Symmetry: C2
Subunit: 329 residues, 2 copies
C-alpha cells in the first residue's frame, strides 16, 4: 500500500465523475501545469482564475495547448452581478453590494463564491496566498457543515516501507479546541479517514491514559471522548490515551486494557494545535512518514489550502483529494 | 556515539568519586541486583533501605555476597531523632515532631531526608512507587535549586544508527508552564544536556515560527524565549520555532533565517506537557529513538524516579546518571 497505490485509488474514485475545481492562482505556473495535467488525464475540470489572455499565455509558455480551459476573470465577470448580490445575500449586516463589488474581486473570494453558487464542486488554493486568504472566505460564504461548528486540518500520514497509514488531529486550524469541538474534530476525521481507505480506530491523545494524570486539559479530552461516542456510536473511539497506549500493544495491555482502540489506533486526535502541529512534524521528520499536506474537513463544499512552497505534483494530489471530497457531497 | 559509549563516558565521570545513592526500594530484586552491580564495579555506594536482615536475604537469594552493604531500616533508625527534628525544622507550620515520626517512616521520605542531611549525595527510586511518592518528598525536603522555581523531566533521545542525540523539554512534570517557568526549564535543560556531552542549541517549540501563527500560547513561548535569553545570554536559544524549522536546514532557511538555532537544534523545549509527553513518545515509537527515562532537573540534590516496570539495567543507568548529577553539585 504505497502512495502511488493510494492515489491510484483516489484517481479511480474521481475519474469520469467530471468534478469541477477552481484554481484561483492562474498566475503560478505550478498550478497551471497541474491544472493542465488533471484536465487531460480526465480527473477533473479546472476553472482557472485570471486575465483570460494572461493565463492562456502561461499555458503556452509552458508548452500546453492554448484552448478549452475554462478561464474566468474576477474583474471582468460576465455575471459579476448575480454574484455580487448572492454575496450580501449571506452576510446581512456586513452584507453590502458596494462592498461585494470590491471584495468579490479578490481571486479567492471569487473562487469560494463560484463554489457557493454551485458553479464549481470545489477549490484548491494557497500556492501564493496565506492560509487565511483561503480559509476566511471559505468560512464566510460556504460554511461549516450542518453537524460541525469548526473546520479542522487532517494529515494523511503514510510510511509505505512499513505498511503504515494514519491520520492526524487538526494540526492546522484550532489553537485550543473545546471538548465539544474536539469531539466534532474526531467525528469529522473518521469520515475523512475513510476517503483514504482507512478503517478508523480513533484515539483521543493526552499525557494521561484513562485517569493516570489529572488536570483540566485531561478532563477536556475525556469529556470530548464521551461527547464523541455520543455523536456517533459506531466509531471505534477511545478516550484519554497517551500516544504509546494508542500505538503499541504491549503498553495498552497494561495502561488501557479492555480498549477497543488502545494498542492499535490509526487515527490520532490531538488535544490542541501545539501538540498536533509539533507532533505530526516529529512523525514526519524523525519518523520518516510522508505527510500529505493539510486537508481541511467539515465544509459544505471542499476547499483546500496548499502550502508555502508546494510542487506541481503536490497541487495535483491535493486537487485529487479535493475532488474525491466533493464526491461525498 | 552509541548508548554504550555515552555510558562509558558517564561511568568515567563517576568512577572513584564515591558518590552515595539511596535506594529506597530494598524490596525489589531489580534494585538489589542493580545496587549490587554498581557497588562492585566501583561506581557508587548504594544505601539500601529496608529490614537489614530482609534485604540481606534477597541479596543471597539472588546469589550475591551478603556483607558490606550499607543497609538502613526506616522504622528502626539509630538516629530517627536528629532526623525526625531536621524534618519539622523545614516544614515549620506543618513541621511537627509527632507527624515527622510517622512520615519519615516511609522509605522515600526517609531517603530524601538522608540526602537532605548530607548523609547521601543522591537518590533513585520509583520501581515500586508512584512518581508522586518520590517527587513529593523531594520537593518538600530538598527543594528546587536557587535559580529555579519548578522541576522538570528531560529525556535523553538517542538514535545511534543515525548519529543523533537530543534532549526533550519537560515531558513529565509541568502540566502547562508559565513563560517564566518555561524559560527556567530551558535554561535548566541546557545544563543537563551538557552532562550528556551535548552542546546545546535550544529551540522553544510552538505551532508558530517567528510570528507565523498568533495566539496567547504563541506569546507564552516567545516571551519565555526572551526571558530565557535574559537568564543566560551564552545559550544558543531561539524562540517560537515549529519542529521542522528547528530540525531541518531547508525549512529554517525559509521560515527562520538568521537563526542561531533553527535547522540544527539538538535541545527541544516543549510548550506544555501535552505536546512534550505525546511528542517524545512519537519520536521514540515512530522515530525509533531510545528514550532514556525521565531525568528530573532543578533540585539541590539529584533525585530520580524510575518507571513503572523498569529493568535492572534501567536502574543501573539511572543511578549512574543520578550520580553524574550529584557531581555537578
Amino acid at each position: 500500500m504505497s502512495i502511488r497505490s493510494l492515489f491510484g485509488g483516489l484517481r479511480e474514485k474521481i475519474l469520469g465523475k467530471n468534478m469541477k475545481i477552481v484554481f484561483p492562482e492562474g498566475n503560478d505556473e505550478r498550478v497551471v501545469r497541474a491544472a493542465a495535467r488533471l484536465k487531460f488525464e480526465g480527473l477533473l475540470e479546472p476553472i482557472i482564475l485570471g486575465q483570460s489572455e494572461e493565463v492562456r499565455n502561461l499555458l503556452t509558455k509552458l508548452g500546453f495547448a492554448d484552448q478549452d480551459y475554462t478561464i474566468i476573470n474576477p474583474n471582468e465577470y460576465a455575471d459579476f452581478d448575480k454574484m455580487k448580490e448572492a454575496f450580501v445575500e449571506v452576510r446581512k449586516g456586513k452584507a453590502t453590494l458596494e462592498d461585494a463589488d470590491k471584495m468579490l474581486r479578490d481571486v479567492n473570494y471569487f473562487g469560494v463564491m463560484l463554489v457557493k453558487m454551485g458553479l464549481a464542486d470545489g477549490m484548491v488554493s494557497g500556492a501564493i496566498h496565506s492560509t487565511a486568504d483561503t480559509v476566511r472566505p471559505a468560512l464566510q460564504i460556504i460554511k461549516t457543515k450542518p453537524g460541525i461548528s469548526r473546520t479542522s486540518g487532517v494529515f494523511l500520514m503514510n510510511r509505505e516501507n512499513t505498511s503504515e497509514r494514519y491520520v492526524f488531529a487538526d494540526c492546522a486550524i484550532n489553537i485550543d479546541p473545546t471538548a465539544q469541538e474536539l469531539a466534532e474534530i474526531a467525528v469529522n476525521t473518521a469520515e475523512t479517514a475513510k476517503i483514504f481507505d482507512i478503517d478508523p480506530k480513533i484515539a483521543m491523545l493526552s499525557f494521561s491514559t484513562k485517569g493516570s494524570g489529572k488536570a483540566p486539559q485531561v478532563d477536556k479530552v475525556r469529556e470530548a471522548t464521551e461527547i464523541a461516542t455520543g455523536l456517533n456510536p459506531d466509531l471505534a473511539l477511545d478516550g484519554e490515551l497517551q500516544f504509546d497506549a494508542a500505538f503499541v500493544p504491549e503498553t495498552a495491555a497494561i495502561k488501557a486494557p479492555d480498549s477497543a482502540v488502545a494498542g492499535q489506533a490509526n487515527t490520532f486526535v490531538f488535544p490542541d494545535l501545539q501538540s498536533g502541529n509539533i507532533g505530526y512534524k516529529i512523525a514526519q521528520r524523525l519518523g520518516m512518514f510522508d505527510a500529505i499536506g493539510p486537508i481541511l474537513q467539515g465544509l459544505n463544499k471542499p476547499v483546500n489550502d496548499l502550502s508555502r512552497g508546494s510542487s506541481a505534483e503536490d497541487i495535483y494530489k491535493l486537487a485529487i483529494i479535493t475532488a474525491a471530497q466533493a464526491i461525498e457531497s
